[PDB]
């Protein structure tokens, strides 16, 4: 029977996925941040294209750097804004979206909030300048490479070195003596290295609530 065929193929009702155990406010913060993050990624790719020496690289490498470094750039830009605006007290995601950690009732969220404040706290503790931050952020784009290697691995090695030199210049500009400079370079490069662990835990948290790489270091 033709009507029997229709009764058979009728799909089952779909569930909305509404979980009342998750409050409306925190649901709205999570979803708004997911959307904001999507737009920050687009903005990061547009920024990278404008970096001296970046488009000169191989299109597959440009693609793989951005795919490795997107959350490095966002968490770091988050740390900077949080330090400048709130002295590392709140997560300053956007001018119209400021998150107070002690308004986050589910523990996993709160612990991730606390961990994101670390980057901010270190930028505050070290009193990092705009010029230092700009150089450090360019270095975060060039901090992860595939074990299988890059196509334009030579031009990358050269450009990373030029940005390590521009950071040295930003440090120099604080007018510290040669001994203050070398310890400041050590401190800023240790923060850079610590980003790997920061991003892994943050990326873990984000996928957990939602559902080949060689991580370069300055210190071994």
């Amino acid at each position: 029977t033709l009507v029997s065929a229709l009764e058979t193929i009728e799909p089952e009702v779909l569930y909305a996925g509404y979980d009342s155990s998750v409050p409306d406010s925190t649901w709205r913060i999570m979803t708004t941040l997911n959307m904001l993050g999507g737009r920050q990624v687009i903005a990061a790719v547009k920024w990278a294209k404008a970096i001296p020496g970046f488009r000169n690289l191989h299109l597959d490498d440009q693609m793989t750097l951005l795919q490795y470094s997107w959350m490095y750039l966002m968490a770091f830009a988050l740390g900077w804004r949080s330090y400048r605006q709130s002295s590392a007290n709140l997560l300053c995601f956007a001018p119209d979206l400021i998150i107070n950690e002690q308004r986050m009732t589910l523990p996993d969220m709160y612990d991730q909030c606390k961990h994101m404040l670390y980057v901010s706290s270190e930028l505050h503790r070290l009193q990092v300048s705009y010029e230092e931050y700009l150089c450090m952020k360019t270095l975060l784009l060039l901090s992860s490479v595939p074990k299988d290697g890059l196509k334009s691995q030579a031009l990358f090695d050269a450009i990373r070195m030029t940005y390590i030199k521009e950071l040295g210049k930003a440090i120099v500009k604080r007018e510290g003596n040669s001994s203050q400079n070398s310890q400041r370079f050590y401190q800023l490069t240790k923060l850079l290295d610590s980003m790997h662990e920061v991003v892994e835990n943050l990326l873990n948290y984000c996928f957990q609530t939602f559902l080949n790489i060689k991580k370069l270091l300055f210190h071994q």
């Binding site: 999507g38 990624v41 687009i42 790719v45 547009k46 294209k49 299109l59 440009q62 693609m63 951005l66 795919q67 997107w70």
Partner: peptide
């Protein structure tokens, strides 16, 4: 996923 978002933004 995000690979497509990065591809669209880089190419455009």
């Amino acid at each position: 996923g995000l690979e497509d978002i990065i591809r669209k933004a880089l190419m455009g």
